[PDB]
Amino acid sequence: SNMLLNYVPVYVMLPLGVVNVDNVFEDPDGLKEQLLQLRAAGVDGVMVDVWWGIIELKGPKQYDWRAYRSLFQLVQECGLTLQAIMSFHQCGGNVGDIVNIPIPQWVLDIGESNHDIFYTNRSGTRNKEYLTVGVDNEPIFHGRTAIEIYSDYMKSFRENMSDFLESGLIIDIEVGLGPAGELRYPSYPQSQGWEFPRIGEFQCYDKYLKADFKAAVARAGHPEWELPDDAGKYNDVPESTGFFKSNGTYVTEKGKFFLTWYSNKLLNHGDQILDEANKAFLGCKVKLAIKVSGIHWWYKVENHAAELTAGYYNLNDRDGYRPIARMLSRHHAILNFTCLEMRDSEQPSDAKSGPQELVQQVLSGGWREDIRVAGENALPRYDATAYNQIILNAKPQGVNNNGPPKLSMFGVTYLRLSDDLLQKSNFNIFKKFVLKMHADQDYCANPQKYNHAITPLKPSAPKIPIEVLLEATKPTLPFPWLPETDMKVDG
Incomplete structure (x- = not known):
């Protein structure tokens, strides 16, 4: 039928701090012109963080929704839909920090007396950005x-927002699951010295995780087994560590047992909280979503180190993502990925980055498990090249002039709505990226037209036992990607 079946919506992420630490909606008039700029370009909607640390600031169950309500009004007045992120994590915290938004101080207060509530590396450094899965x-x-x-x-x-829900302003609820709202461990903390091509460290050292582990190795028949002590430091390179070296520990029955335990905590972490989300929004015309991190560095060495430390147990012969997709499927959730823009020929060669293949693996796995897949760009880009990358990933096999594409992403949330974006030459390319995402159709206000109607969320399907999730570790061949998109921004 209609080309319109090829339309992939586009969202734009609002500026960090649009509502400040003080719970104040700062500059309504300013955002306003911006939002209007966006709607004219043909932007389908916007995405905002809903800081847990601004809202439940004063005390347990002392929520103040006002400043967010004002923000949602204005969006709705601008003809834009909205993706809300349940952000239970810290914003910023490091050097030359744009905005800094810690988690509820009253939680912080408990942590002065119980440090084991934070992720802790092996040296004993407490990461405060987020509560350890050990305390779920x-x-x-x-x-x-x-x-x-x-x-x-x-x-x-x-x-407190039923009105906006009832009225269809809110399209999806992204549930924040760790640092940066991502279902992963705080393995590469800038705040701790982490620099890029660096492997990162495992974060299972708080009393809770350590006790969990030791009970588990004891049940497995190896009480004597300990947490990794040969993995190195954030900035290492893998051949330089006993864990990750060739024939290292990460290939031992003690290391494999570790990695399975460590990666499984995320799966179970995500599963339970998504359970609660399904409860909270049952009935609403929204879709649930989670953010999965794009760790492309070391993707191309057998050990996939940075992924491992992050909790993504992905090897060349063990699919560590498809299990997430599978888990998501019982909640009817969307897998929201990133690094959609990155090309392989853009990375330091000594970082062994495999962004493109990473993307093919993650997306394919979702489509495979029959879930919906979305993504973002990881970094700020304004060039046709980024844009064309994003466009290829969105519709990996090009447009179907005869129907819907066999493969297409559910939506793409462009990163950051800044003055830069809005600059003339810049915005001009954006408008084009927007046009091509939409497959050359005009912005389409009724989503039903392009087969995205939202239905009232249903209850989760029943628990999938880990043994069944783990079956999805079986590696598969990705689907076929065009070398280039048939719908380029760049004439």
């Missing part, structure tokens, strides 16, 4: 567990 179910936060906190927060949101 520890009723230590004035009677509540962490999952309860997150659950309550999503429930409060649902109720």
Whole structure:
């Protein structure tokens, strides 16, 4: 039928701090002209972080939704839909920090007395950006567990914003699952010295994770087994560590057991909280989503080190992403990926980066598991090259002049809405990127037309036992990518 079946929507992410630490919607008039600039270009919607640390600031269950309400009004007045991120993580925190938004101080307060609530590397450094999965179910936060906190927060949101939900402003709810809202471990902390082509460190050292592990190796028949002590430091390179070296420890029955344990905590972390989300939004016309990190560096050495330390147990012969997709499928959730723009020929050669193949692996795995796949660009780009990369990934096999494409992404959330973007020559290319994403059609306000109607969220399907999830580790061949998009921005 209609070319319109080829339309891939486009979202633009709002500026960090649009609502400040103080819970103040700063510059309504300013955002306003911007938002209007966007709607004219043909942007389908926008994406905003909903800081847990601004909202539940004063105390447990002391939520103040006002400044966000004002923000949602204005968006809705601008003819834009909106993706909301349940951000339970810290914003910024390091040097020359744009905005800094820590987590609720009252939580921080508990951590001065119980440090084991933060991710901890082997040296004992406490990462404060996010609560360790080790406390998901520890009723230590004035009677509540962490999952309860997150659950309550999503429930409060649902109720205090029913109007916008009822009215279809909010298209999807992205559930924040770790640092940067990503389902992963804080393995490469800039704040800790991490520099790029660096492998990163495992983050399983808090008392809770350590005790978990030791009980588990004891059940497995090896009480004597300890956490990795040969993995190195953030900035290492893998052949330089006993864990990751060839025939290293990461290939030992003790290392494999470790990695499975460590990666499985994320899966279970995501699964339970997504459970709570499904509860909170049952009935609403929204889709649930999670962000999965694009760790492309070391993708091209057998050991896939940076991925491993992050909790993505992905090897050349063990698919460590498809299990996530599979987990998501019971909640009818979307896998929101990134690094959609990156090309292989753009990386330091000594970083062994495999962004393109990484992307093919992640997307294929989702389509394979029959879920919906979305993504973002990881870094700020303004050139046709980035744009054409993003366009290829979106419709890996090109346009179907005869129907819907056999393969297409569910949406792409461009990164950052700055003055730079809005600059003339820049914006001009953007408009084109927007046109091509839309497959050359005009912006389309009814999503049903291009087969994206949203239905009221249903209850999750039943638990998938880990043994069944783990089956998805079986490697598969990606689907076929065109070498280049048939719909280039660049004439």
